[PDB]
């Protein structure tokens, strides 16, 4: 796939084997998003000063406002003492019923007081708790069901109504693909973009268009590629001297084949690269003849005047390319290529050499140290623990209770039975 | 430390006295972050339609999916009227006990009704509330214990999987310094970078690598400095006239390995105090002879890059420690001070002004501000948030006293019967 040729003749490396995608147009789609509004339920909550539902909408309505502004005499005598005893007996039995009645009276009042606690003290609070829990739930549910709308208003808030790249909040993947399959382009381009959604998002804009409290609307602006699948290559250059004068080619950057000519992108920011794929922007690009490529082999090429920068003095540096590094070691300066396993493995003499990132890890011109490869470093790890929710339900001894209440009624039943006994021996 | 010399000969100012740090490499570390997951406890809450824990996970699992896609026959008769009298008496006492029994029965059923309210009506609601409160707490604890993970997923979502600078969510200060102490560099650089964490962050990248529901992984890409503590200087230029010429080699310059490195894009160099951090990626290597261009344009040792004009021209360039003024032709220029008092009128030529003495310079009708203009201070007031929790208390002691009083009355009732029985058997 991707390789790299080094031309000692002009001290320069070319990185061949890329495939282009030049932006030459814009595709605009108008996305719209409705608000899942919250209806504030009026009821007495836990704290009268805490109006969460209101304070949450206000917060929102404000953000929306801020954006809007951017646009047998012995028997008788005995039978007498009998009657007398049972009289006294009945007097105590009467007292007993009077005591029990007072007992029951107090108990009754305490039963009334118990209910009135539940009704006047406890019940109102448990309803006030239901209101606060309902309010809270609603607020959290507002923040969940308007997740995207809320992320987008932050994005527009942060960037004053114009963002890039186009986030996954602004435009989801299936929506992006939906838009892609509707663009006026060939199937290969649709396929390409579908495969490089990341790059595509990074070349896109999102411009706030209409914002009202209940609905938000904004144009998404995706790139259109006028041509694709043409050879690209990236040119690196280092100084070149004699062994005296020095020269340096000044046309570094990307090159793409565009309609029989070469497109030249000298600003690094204008080209994105993913694998063997390059995505450039024709907006501020230079058009050159295909003869510029002869400058890689011959400087005094009579078919195109090569752009160079001269020097009357020896000069030395290193340029780090895509698959290695160029080294320009002239004068009394000492250069060395080193390796992570063998230290210094090469000392450069006067001239222009090239080094591959396969065998060399660093290059050292004078006292300056160049890294031909990324230095892999310390792995870091942030551990997490499961979050647990402790819900312990409240249970009442219903059965045990009911058994005792049934016993109470049983005692009452025998009480009426014993009286039916007593009355029956009297005449009913 | 940092000063500024002005060369009238070529109309240009140099800002001497900086110390370099030229990026020539990348250091990459693979950071990973686990999810403090939430196990959804299934139970009936307050609202059956409100499944917060789930609706919260769904929100998250979605975000994670979206990122993934970027990749004695008289006595007898008397004794009879006695028996008849006490008979009637006992009949009413019987009537009495039936009333109390009916009384107690109604009360008993109402005690049952009170309990059944508590168990069937009240208790389930207090449990449904306990569940919703549990659910809520869980969601909030999710947002708190995964704060960092969640901030990172927003960042990658917003920037399509590649951010810069490296936030404090992506890499904390103690982690950054850790990584710095692990880079293959000298103790002097480790000291330098550990001291300029802000700049280091602004020259760093963060590249999403692997994103799964329960764990996130991403490469942090830090800068490596191939050389440091070499003299830097920033050159400004303005037009010079008699035809006109202007040096077109503005920008930063650093002494690099026996040669001069030249950084022509302004964004490529960061500055903090006397410290400069430049990026060698697209830099030009020049011989030390370029520096004579500062004193002589037609210097025989290096052809200076200049831009000419056959007509008079006037402007102002604002340097780091002042400002150059090129006042030629019929244009009138003037320096004023931070009080706007006019302190100097410029004639035909190329002059220099220090930001110590001048605050603004006026070329023609166009106004240059040599210094930041201090403005109106603003203040946003805040007030303490208060949480009012008023607990619910029951009169336990008073109650128990009444119940003990009821039991005393029952006991005395049993005593009186024990008395009555005693007089009978």
């Amino acid at each position, epitope marked *: 796939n991707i390789t790299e040729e080094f031309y000692q003749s002009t001290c320069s490396a070319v990185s061949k084997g890329y495939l282009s995608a030049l932006r030459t147009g814009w595709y605009t789609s108008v996305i719209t998003i409705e608000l899942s509004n919250i209806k504030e339920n009026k009821c007495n909550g836990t704290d009268a000063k805490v109006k969460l539902i209101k304070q949450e909408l206000d917060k929102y309505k404000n953000a929306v406002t801020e954006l809007q502004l951017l646009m047998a005499v012995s028997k008788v005598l005995h039978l007498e003492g009998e009657v007398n005893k049972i009289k006294s007996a009945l007097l105590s039995t009467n007292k007993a019923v009077v005591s029990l009645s007072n007992g029951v009276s107090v108990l009754t009042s305490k039963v009334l007081d118990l209910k009135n606690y539940i009704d006047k003290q406890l019940l109102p609070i448990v309803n006030k708790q239901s209101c606060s829990i309902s309010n809270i739930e609603t607020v959290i549910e507002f923040q969940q069901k308007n997740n995207r709308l809320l992320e987008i208003t932050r994005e527009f808030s942060v960037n004053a109504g114009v963002t890039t790249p186009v986030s996954t909040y602004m435009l989801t993947n299936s929506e992006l693909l939906s838009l892609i399959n509707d663009m006026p382009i060939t199937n290969d381009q649709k396929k390409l973009m579908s495969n490089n959604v990341q790059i595509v998002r990074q070349q896109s804009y999102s411009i706030m268009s209409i914002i009202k409290e209940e609905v938000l609307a904004y144009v998404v602006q995706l790139p259109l590629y006028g041509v694709i699948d043409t050879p690209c290559w990236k040119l690196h250059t280092s100084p070149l001297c004699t062994t005296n004068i020095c020269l340096t080619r000044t046309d570094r950057g990307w090159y793409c084949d565009n309609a029989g000519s070469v497109s030249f992108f000298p600003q690094a920011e204008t080209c994105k690269v993913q694998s063997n794929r390059v995505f450039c922007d024709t907006m501020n690009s230079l058009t050159l003849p295909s003869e510029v490529n002869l400058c890689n082999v011959d400087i005094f090429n009579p078919k195109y005047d090569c752009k160079i920068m001269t020097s009357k*003095t020896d000069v030395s540096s290193s340029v780090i390319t895509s698959l290695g590094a160029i080294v320009s070691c002239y004068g009394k300066t000492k250069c060395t290529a080193s390796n992570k396993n063998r230290g210094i493995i090469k000392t450069f003499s006067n001239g222009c050499d090239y080094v591959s990132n396969k065998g060399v890890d660093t290059v050292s011109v004078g006292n300056t140290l160049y890294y031909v490869n990324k230095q892999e470093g310390k792995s870091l790890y942030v551990k997490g623990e499961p979050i647990i929710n402790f819900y312990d339900p409240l249970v009442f001894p219903s059965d045990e209770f009911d058994a005792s209440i049934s016993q109470v009624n049983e005692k009452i039943n025998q009480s009426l039975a014993f009286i039916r006994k007593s009355d029956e021996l009297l005449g009913l | 430390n940092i000063t500024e010399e002005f060369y*009238q000969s070529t109309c240009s100012a140099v800002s*001497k006295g900086y110390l370099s740090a030229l990026r020539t490499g990348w250091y990459t570390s693979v950071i990973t972050i686990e999810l403090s997951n939430i196990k959804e406890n299934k139970c009936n809450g307050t609202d059956a339609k409100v499944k917060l824990i789930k609706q919260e996970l769904d929100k998250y699992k979605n975000a994670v999916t979206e990122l993934q896609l970027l990749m004695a026959v008289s006595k007898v008769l008397h004794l009879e009227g006695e028996v008849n009298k006490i008979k009637s008496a006992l009949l009413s006492t019987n009537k009495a006990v039936v009333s109390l029994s009916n009384g107690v029965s109604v009360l008993t059923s109402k005690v049952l009704d009170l309990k059944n309210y508590i168990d069937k009506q009240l208790l389930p609601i207090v449990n449904k509330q306990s569940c919703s409160i549990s659910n809520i707490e869980t969601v909030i604890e999710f947002q708190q214990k995964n704060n960092r993970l969640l901030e990172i997923t927003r960042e990658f979502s917003v920037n399509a999987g590649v951010t810069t600078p490296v936030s404090t969510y992506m890499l904390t200060n103690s982690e950054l310094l850790s990584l710095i102490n692990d880079m293959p560099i000298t103790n002097d650089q480790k000291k330098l970078m550990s001291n300029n964490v802000q700049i280091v962050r602004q020259q760093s990248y963060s590249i999403m690598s692997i994103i799964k529901e329960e764990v996130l992984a991403y490469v942090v890409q830090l800068p490596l400095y191939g050389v440091i503590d070499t003299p830097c*200087w920033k050159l400004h230029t303005s037009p010079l006239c008699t035809i006109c010429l202007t040096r077109t080699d503005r920008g930063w*310059y650093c002494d690099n390995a026996g040669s001069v490195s030249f950084f022509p894009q302004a964004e490529t160099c960061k500055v903090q105090s006397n410290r400069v951090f430049c990026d060698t990626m697209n830099s030009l290597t020049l011989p030390s002879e370029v520096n004579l261009c*500062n*004193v002589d344009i037609f210097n025989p*040792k290096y052809d200076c890059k200049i831009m000419t004009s056959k007509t008079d021209v006037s402007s102002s360039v604002i340097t780091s420690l002042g400002a150059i003024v090129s006042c030629y032709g019929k244009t009138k220029c003037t320096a004023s001070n931070k009080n706007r008092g006019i302190i100097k009128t410029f004639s035909n030529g190329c002059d220099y002004v220090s930001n110590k003495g001048v605050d603004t310079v006026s070329v023609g009708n166009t106004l240059y501000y040599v210094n930041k203009q201090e403005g109106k201070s603003l203040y946003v007031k805040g007030e303490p948030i208060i949480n009012f929790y008023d607990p619910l208390v029951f009169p336990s002691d008073e109650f128990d006293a009444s119940i003990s009083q009821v039991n005393e009355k029952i006991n005395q009732s049993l005593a009186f019967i024990r008395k009555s029985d005693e007089l009978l058997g």
Partner: antibody
Amino acid sequence: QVTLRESGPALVKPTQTLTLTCTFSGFSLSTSGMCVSWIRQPPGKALEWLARIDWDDDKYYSTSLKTRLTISKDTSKNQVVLTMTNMDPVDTATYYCARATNYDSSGYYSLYFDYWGQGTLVTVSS
Amino acid sequence: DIQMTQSPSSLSASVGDRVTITCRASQSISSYLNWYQQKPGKAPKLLIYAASSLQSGVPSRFSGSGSGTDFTLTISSLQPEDFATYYCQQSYSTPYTFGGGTKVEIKR
């Protein structure tokens, strides 16, 4: 060691031409950055810069004394030669030759004479 | 041509004194300024180059200062061997110029 020595006449007759020869070692004018200059000094008076020659055969002269001065190098012999025509008694002075290197760092290019020859005294008299 | 003006011309100070010599250029010359010391009978010797850079070999009690027009040669503690004439020289424009000189004797 970087050393310089000036040879030449001790006595020159008026109107005649003076020729001084600066023999050096420890450095070469083949090396860039290296320069050699000529400084003279009338008895009891201030120093006076006369001529300079660089590695690339660049030559500079005192403006008022330019017409009478000629400097040349012979790097194969490590020698710089100065020529002053029409010598006058008012040209009696001590003639030094000196190496000049340039201050390179920090956007500077300030030439300075780090090494001086002992100096030879040239008297002009009939 | 750029004229150099030293001050004072003559100077007397005891051993240990802090001696302060002034140089002034007819025009601004950045830090293109050198200081030389010339003892009797000998050739001049480099002290300070580029206004404030101390030449290796020269004792640390010598220090240069200044930029633009006004420059300063300084001896922190004058000493018996510091007897010499001190010259300032500009390296800015083509005809290199020295100053009138500053003779420094020693008071004992």
